[PDB]
Amino acid sequence: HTVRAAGAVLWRDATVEVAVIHRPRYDDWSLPKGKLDQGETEPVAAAREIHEETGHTAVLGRRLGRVTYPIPQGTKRVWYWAAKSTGGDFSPNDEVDKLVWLPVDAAMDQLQYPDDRKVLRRFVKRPVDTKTVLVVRHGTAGRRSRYKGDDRKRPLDKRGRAQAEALVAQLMAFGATTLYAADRVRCHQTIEPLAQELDQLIHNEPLLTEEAYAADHKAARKRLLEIAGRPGNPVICTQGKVIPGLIEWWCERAKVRPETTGNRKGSTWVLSLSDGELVGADYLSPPDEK
Numbered sequence: 001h002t003v004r005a006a007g008a009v010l011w012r013d014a015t016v017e018v019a020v021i022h023r024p025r026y027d028d029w030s031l032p033k034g035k036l037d038q039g040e041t042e043p044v045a046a047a048r049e050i051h052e053e054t055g056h057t058a059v060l061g062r063r064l065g066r067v068t069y070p071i072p073q074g075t076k077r078v079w080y081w082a083a084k085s086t087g088g089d090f091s092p093n094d095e096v097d098k099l100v101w102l103p104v105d106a107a108m109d110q111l112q113y114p115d116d117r118k119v120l121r122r123f124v125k126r127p128v129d130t131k132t133v134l135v136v137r138h139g140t141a142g143r144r145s146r147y148k149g150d151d152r153k154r155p156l157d158k159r160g161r162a163q164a165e166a167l168v169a170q171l172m173a174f175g176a177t178t179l180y181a182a183d184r185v186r187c188h189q190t191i192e193p194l195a196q197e198l199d200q201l202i203h204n205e206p207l208l209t210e211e212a213y214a215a216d217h218k219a220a221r222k223r224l225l226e227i228a229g230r231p232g233n234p235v236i237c238t239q240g241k242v243i244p245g246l247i248e249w250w251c252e253r254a255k256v257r258p259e260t261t262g263n264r265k266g267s268t269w270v271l272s273l274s275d276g277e278l279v280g281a282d283y284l285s286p287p288d289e290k
């Protein structure tokens, strides 16, 4: 069987230092990570396990990649992120007895596994002090036929509401701070739970609906960049016919290659920016899908 895990290169400003952990079970030095709990998304697992193992909270930025290796039971699949420490301090735990903070070249030496070393090379290849734009497709909301009444008003269904609730921890893992949604009830409702958590209002965005994108895709592009330019990490909840077009455009111009792709309801594109420039685009499946 495949064991799914997530973790990070945890970093702080000293130029940058990264955490390497020691485990007496293997007398090994490695990166903080662990297994996904039932129902848990990779980002949320990563944040948890980082804090379990290092004693630090972190905000996840760019996704580093996936690595896969044999273990006695089968196969270990681990997703890694760059993650900046937001606080805390190490104290020894059950698995991890020591942690060191190292500049990257020394950390590469301290590491011992090829997969960890690969992830660390991925970390250094781009800027890590990134800002993050979270582009979310609204949750499940039945079919446009099944709900007559102004389709603008069609609500999230039971699943979609559960997706919205699950997106709170997902989006908070990336340090979401400001909320925007296309002018459709289902788009707002997707991020209402996060709005309440953050105690933030949701900015309504008539230029980012499907109808508006179809009429004037250029105004949508410009408005996306306007939003991305504001301070904070914005969530922008919009629709299925809008997202691929915006993401594809921006990735092509920035020469950013996504490691994964898709467009499902409740999915999230994590766009990482350095000094306003796009440097990563990471598609996350819906929180209730694999």
Ligand SMILES: Nc1nc2c([nH]c(=O)n2[C@H]2C[C@H](O)[C@@H](COP(=O)(O)OP(=O)(O)OP(=O)(O)O)O2)c(=O)[nH]1
Pocket (backbone or CB within 6 Å): 005, 026, 030, 031, 033, 034, 035, 069, 070, 071, 076, 113, 114, 115, 116, 117
């Ligand atoms: N942490 C880590 N372990 C690895 C890598 N490559 C590699 O063969 N291993 C080995 C170390 C162990 O002998 C074996 C399983 O270690 P593990 O850290 O993946 O799994 P674990 O279940 O003991 O710990 P975890 O997922 O709960 O943190 O795999 C790697 O890149 N990182």
Ligand SMILES: [Cl-]
Pocket (backbone or CB within 6 Å): 088, 089, 090, 099
């Ligand atoms: Cl520490």
Ligand SMILES: [Cl-]
Pocket (backbone or CB within 6 Å): 141, 142, 144
């Ligand atoms: Cl829909």
Ligand SMILES: [Mg+2]
Pocket (backbone or CB within 6 Å): 032, 033, 034, 035, 049, 053, 095
């Ligand atoms: Mg672990």
